[PDB]
Amino acid sequence: XTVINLFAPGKVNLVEQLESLSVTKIGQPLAVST
Amino acid sequence: XTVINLFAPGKVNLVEQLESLSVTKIGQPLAVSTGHHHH
Amino acid sequence: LPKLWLTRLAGWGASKRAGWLTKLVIDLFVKYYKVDMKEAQKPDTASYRTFNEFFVRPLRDEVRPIDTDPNVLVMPADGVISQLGKIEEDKILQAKGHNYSLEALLAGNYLMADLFRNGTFVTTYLSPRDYHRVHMPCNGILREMIYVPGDLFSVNHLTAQNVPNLFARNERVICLFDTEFGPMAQILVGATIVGSIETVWAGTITPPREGIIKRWTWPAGENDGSVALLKGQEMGRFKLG
Amino acid sequence: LQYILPKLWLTRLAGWGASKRAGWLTKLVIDLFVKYYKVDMKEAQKPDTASYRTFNEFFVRPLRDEVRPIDTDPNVLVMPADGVISQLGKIEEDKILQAKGHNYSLEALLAGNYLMADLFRNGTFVTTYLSPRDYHRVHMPCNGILREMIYVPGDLFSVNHLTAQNVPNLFARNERVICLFDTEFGPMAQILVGATIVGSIETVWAGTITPPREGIIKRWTWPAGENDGSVALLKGQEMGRFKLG
């Protein structure tokens, strides 16, 4: 296995497509700066 | 079990008689302040 | 079953060079778990001297393209999202009707937790199927690493839904970085059998399991002996033991 | 056997047993215990071994006020527990002596708390060992204001001198409660470390800290002396205990 990311408040928005059980591949978009 | 005490540097001197396996009873002297206090 | 003893055993097994028996256990594993050896750098299941060598297998350079948009933070591991979203003050969602303390996750480190109060979290689940190395989601300067002793519960969805504070009590390595997006924490949490955690800068953190918390620090970017990693660069991995 | 034994399961069992009210069988196990361990029930507030409804009630027994006179000299910090000194002296930077050729990190003991560790770098430490024989409550070595309490999950190794000499980082890895106080001698830490069987820790201000064992670190804070809802204890006043569980 498990990996946990923590980001500071108001620094990123998670790509809205992603939700519980969405498939992840290294290098695909996770979040976008603000 | 076990109890561990931590004191800041230069605040207390441990009774010099005490060593590993010296018997401990609640209320007996453990250490003496480096600075004078008074009743 | 005793979860540590089982893990120590699997780690003994996974690290032995048994040619034909290694290939057998690898092949059973590949078949039972639907592993996509297409994406492996060495697809021949016979190419792996030990089981662990296979578990930690590299991928073909081309197959993990890193989105180059510098406003995009990329995914750090193959698998599926467990949960993600806003950190509701100190509260992080584990599963339906199971929250956990941000402070707990960070092994009582109230300073680090404060950086992330009301922030964002992503919990990625790596199944045995998946590539078991972890890559950076963005550029970062490594500032802090904390090893946290703990339990070796399973971390599958069944266990997530049933064991309270699972990720806050399981053995893990906390990595804190400075980034263009402020502080960023990336935490490698072990599980039963797959309890060995490494980072690229420090080798294998565990085992051995000395039962105490260890903290390492590095200076800010502009200094001698600072450590910098680039978006998509391998930063660590999981293996058996 | 300390790595072989299932130390938690044994401790959960002893705690089930120690908390049952079994009249004659309680008195029997108490009496065998008293005899085998040379317990001095003379000093007990209720010396009749029959006065104790459960084994744990006996284990946590009070003493006669008069048998533990508290040195009233306010320059004197007094001993907080019956037993014997394990080790004591200067903290050599971050290094604390466990046994001959066994040191442990001050930061490790304090569960990675670098702020608290700084208070005590190059300071003084005392490790007191309570044997089953001894009274199992812990008293304040001087007046103090309670500021911080940290529960640390961990192993339940034995903490006798044999184990001290052989298990590395014993006190840094065994389950414990860290209590930080303000005193006239600056910050003072008093840490209650559990052992196999005797794994239950209480404080007077919070009741029983463990069990249950939720496997996470918990931190509580209190304000400075001059405030609503602050907690103050006096030299020689009971602050906590150990029991079976």
Residue numbers in the entry:
A (entry chain D): 254 to 287
B (entry chain B): 254 to 292
C (entry chain C): 13 to 253
D (entry chain A): 9 to 253
Which of the paper's sentences describe this entry?
Phosphatidylethanolamine (PE), a major component of the cellular membrane across all domains of life, is synthesized exclusively by membrane-anchored phosphatidylserine decarboxylase (PSD) in most bacteria. PSD is translated as an inactive proenzyme and undergoes self-cleavage between a conserved Gly-Ser pair to become an active αβ-heterodimer. This maturation step results in the post-translational modification of the N-terminus serine to pyruvoyl in the α-subunit, which is an indispensable prosthetic group for decarboxylation activity. After the proenzyme undergoes auto-proteolysis, an active complex is formed between the α- and β-chains, which are mainly responsible for catalytic activity and membrane association, respectively.
